[PDB]
Amino acid sequence: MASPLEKALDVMVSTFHKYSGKEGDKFKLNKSELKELLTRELPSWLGKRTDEAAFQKLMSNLDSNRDNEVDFQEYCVFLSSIAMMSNEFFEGFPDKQPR
Amino acid sequence: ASPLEKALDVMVSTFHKYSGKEGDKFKLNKSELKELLTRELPSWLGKRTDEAAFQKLMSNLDSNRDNEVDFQEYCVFLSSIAMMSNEFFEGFP
Amino acid sequence: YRKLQRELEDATETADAMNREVSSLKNKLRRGDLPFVVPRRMA
Ligand SMILES: [Ca+2]
Ligand SMILES: [Ca+2]
Ligand SMILES: [Ca+2]
Ligand SMILES: [Ca+2]
């Protein structure tokens, strides 16, 4: 019954907790868990800067309420931004582009 | 591609399945949003038909006030749904 | 479907704030501020 989009939403939820529940606050991603999730679940989105200083900068900017963790809402804000990049790729093509 | 990477692409593809039907090729009007919700998110439909409720949802989503739902606003919509599903995930173990 | 009315509405009451948060992050990524992530979709 579930549509692809409905299943997609379930993946957003389940992937988060695959990593958040490893250490400390089981409902938030610490630096280590975030790095795991990104590296294992979003490999196509990893940039040319792989250093800790670069990752720290991302962590800090995702951690909007400044509690040193990434909660589900902050995680969704990041996912949205990624989806938007993919959409910009999508909309660059002519309307009848083959697919 | 991981399940998560594929899921994000499904979000993109589903949007354009409906956005291209009328008017602006890259935004959802009221009619297109209603279609997307009904056909792709039936699990989130209200218990009874309620036009006033739908209009209110449209207004909530239309953050930039242009009478349409663009892709970013649609992501916020999907995020809001995921956040509710997450409340369920966490609230009742 | 749901057992109630207006849950999607409840869920999107802070949509404005979230949009402003997403815009901020998207902008940082676009500006190349966060090179740990790709600036544009890649293969
Ligand atoms: Ca944790
Ligand atoms: Ca935080
Ligand atoms: Ca349209
Ligand atoms: Ca709008």
CSV table of N, CA and C in Angstrom, one decimal, chain A residues 15 18-19 22 29-47 49-52 54-56 58 62 75 78-79 82, chain B residues 1-5, chain C residues 36-38:
chain,number,residue,atom,x,y,z
A,15,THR,N,16.9,5.8,9.4
A,15,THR,CA,18.4,6.0,9.2
A,15,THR,C,19.0,6.8,10.3
A,18,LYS,N,19.4,4.7,13.4
A,18,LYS,CA,20.4,3.7,13.1
A,18,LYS,C,21.7,4.1,13.8
A,19,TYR,N,21.9,5.4,13.8
A,19,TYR,CA,23.1,6.0,14.3
A,19,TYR,C,23.0,6.8,15.6
A,22,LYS,N,23.4,4.9,19.2
A,22,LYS,CA,24.7,4.2,19.5
A,22,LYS,C,25.3,4.7,20.8
A,29,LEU,N,22.3,12.9,17.3
A,29,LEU,CA,23.5,12.5,16.7
A,29,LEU,C,24.7,13.3,17.3
A,30,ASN,N,25.6,12.7,18.0
A,30,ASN,CA,26.9,13.4,18.4
A,30,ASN,C,27.8,13.4,17.2
A,31,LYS,N,29.0,14.1,17.3
A,31,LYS,CA,29.9,14.3,16.2
A,31,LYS,C,30.2,12.9,15.6
A,32,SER,N,30.5,11.9,16.4
A,32,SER,CA,30.9,10.6,15.8
A,32,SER,C,29.8,9.9,15.0
A,33,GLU,N,28.6,10.0,15.6
A,33,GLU,CA,27.4,9.3,14.9
A,33,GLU,C,27.0,10.1,13.6
A,34,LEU,N,27.1,11.4,13.6
A,34,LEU,CA,26.9,12.2,12.4
A,34,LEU,C,27.8,11.8,11.3
A,35,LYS,N,29.1,11.7,11.7
A,35,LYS,CA,30.2,11.4,10.7
A,35,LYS,C,29.9,10.0,10.1
A,36,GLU,N,29.5,9.0,11.0
A,36,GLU,CA,29.1,7.7,10.5
A,36,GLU,C,28.0,7.8,9.5
A,37,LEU,N,26.9,8.4,9.9
A,37,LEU,CA,25.7,8.5,9.0
A,37,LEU,C,26.1,9.1,7.6
A,38,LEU,N,26.8,10.3,7.7
A,38,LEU,CA,27.2,10.9,6.4
A,38,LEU,C,28.1,10.0,5.6
A,39,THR,N,29.1,9.4,6.2
A,39,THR,CA,30.0,8.6,5.5
A,39,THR,C,29.4,7.3,4.9
A,40,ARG,N,28.5,6.7,5.6
A,40,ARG,CA,27.9,5.5,5.2
A,40,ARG,C,26.6,5.6,4.4
A,41,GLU,N,25.8,6.6,4.7
A,41,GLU,CA,24.5,6.8,4.1
A,41,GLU,C,24.4,7.9,3.1
A,42,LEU,N,25.4,8.8,3.1
A,42,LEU,CA,25.4,9.9,2.1
A,42,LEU,C,26.7,10.1,1.4
A,43,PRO,N,27.4,9.0,1.0
A,43,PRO,CA,28.7,9.0,0.4
A,43,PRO,C,28.8,9.9,-0.8
A,44,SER,N,27.8,9.9,-1.6
A,44,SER,CA,27.8,10.7,-2.9
A,44,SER,C,27.9,12.2,-2.6
A,45,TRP,N,27.6,12.6,-1.3
A,45,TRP,CA,27.5,14.0,-1.0
A,45,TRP,C,28.7,14.5,-0.2
A,46,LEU,N,29.7,13.7,0.0
A,46,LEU,CA,30.9,14.0,0.7
A,46,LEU,C,31.9,14.9,-0.3
A,47,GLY,N,32.3,16.0,0.2
A,47,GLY,CA,33.1,16.9,-0.6
A,47,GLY,C,34.6,16.7,-0.5
A,49,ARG,N,36.9,18.3,1.0
A,49,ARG,CA,37.5,18.5,2.3
A,49,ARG,C,37.0,17.5,3.3
A,50,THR,N,37.9,16.5,3.6
A,50,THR,CA,37.5,15.4,4.5
A,50,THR,C,38.1,15.5,5.9
A,51,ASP,N,38.8,16.6,6.1
A,51,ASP,CA,39.5,16.8,7.4
A,51,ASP,C,38.6,17.1,8.6
A,52,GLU,N,39.1,16.9,9.8
A,52,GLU,CA,38.2,17.1,11.0
A,52,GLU,C,37.8,18.5,11.2
A,54,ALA,N,37.0,20.6,8.8
A,54,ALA,CA,35.9,20.8,7.9
A,54,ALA,C,34.7,20.2,8.4
A,55,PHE,N,34.8,19.0,9.0
A,55,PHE,CA,33.7,18.3,9.5
A,55,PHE,C,33.1,19.0,10.8
A,56,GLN,N,34.0,19.5,11.6
A,56,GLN,CA,33.6,20.3,12.8
A,56,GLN,C,32.8,21.5,12.3
A,58,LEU,N,30.9,21.8,9.7
A,58,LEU,CA,29.6,21.3,9.3
A,58,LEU,C,28.7,21.0,10.5
A,62,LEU,N,25.2,22.7,11.5
A,62,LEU,CA,24.0,21.9,11.6
A,62,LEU,C,23.4,22.0,13.0
A,75,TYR,N,18.5,17.7,11.6
A,75,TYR,CA,18.8,16.6,10.6
A,75,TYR,C,17.9,16.7,9.3
A,78,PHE,N,19.0,19.7,7.2
A,78,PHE,CA,20.2,19.3,6.3
A,78,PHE,C,19.7,18.4,5.1
A,79,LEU,N,18.8,17.4,5.4
A,79,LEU,CA,18.3,16.6,4.3
A,79,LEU,C,17.6,17.4,3.3
A,82,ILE,N,20.0,19.1,1.0
A,82,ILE,CA,20.5,18.2,0.0
A,82,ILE,C,19.5,17.9,-1.1
B,1,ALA,N,23.8,3.3,-4.6
B,1,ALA,CA,23.2,4.4,-3.7
B,1,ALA,C,22.5,3.8,-2.5
B,2,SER,N,22.7,4.4,-1.3
B,2,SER,CA,22.1,4.0,-0.1
B,2,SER,C,20.6,4.2,-0.1
B,3,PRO,N,19.9,3.6,0.8
B,3,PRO,CA,18.4,3.8,0.8
B,3,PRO,C,18.1,5.3,1.1
B,4,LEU,N,18.9,6.0,1.9
B,4,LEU,CA,18.7,7.4,2.2
B,4,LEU,C,18.9,8.3,0.9
B,5,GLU,N,19.9,8.0,0.2
B,5,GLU,CA,20.2,8.8,-1.1
B,5,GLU,C,19.1,8.6,-2.1
C,36,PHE,N,33.1,20.3,3.4
C,36,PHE,CA,33.0,18.9,3.8
C,36,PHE,C,31.9,18.2,2.9
C,37,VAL,N,30.9,19.0,2.5
C,37,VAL,CA,29.9,18.6,1.6
C,37,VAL,C,30.1,19.1,0.2
C,38,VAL,N,29.6,18.4,-0.8
C,38,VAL,CA,29.7,18.9,-2.2
C,38,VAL,C,28.9,20.1,-2.4
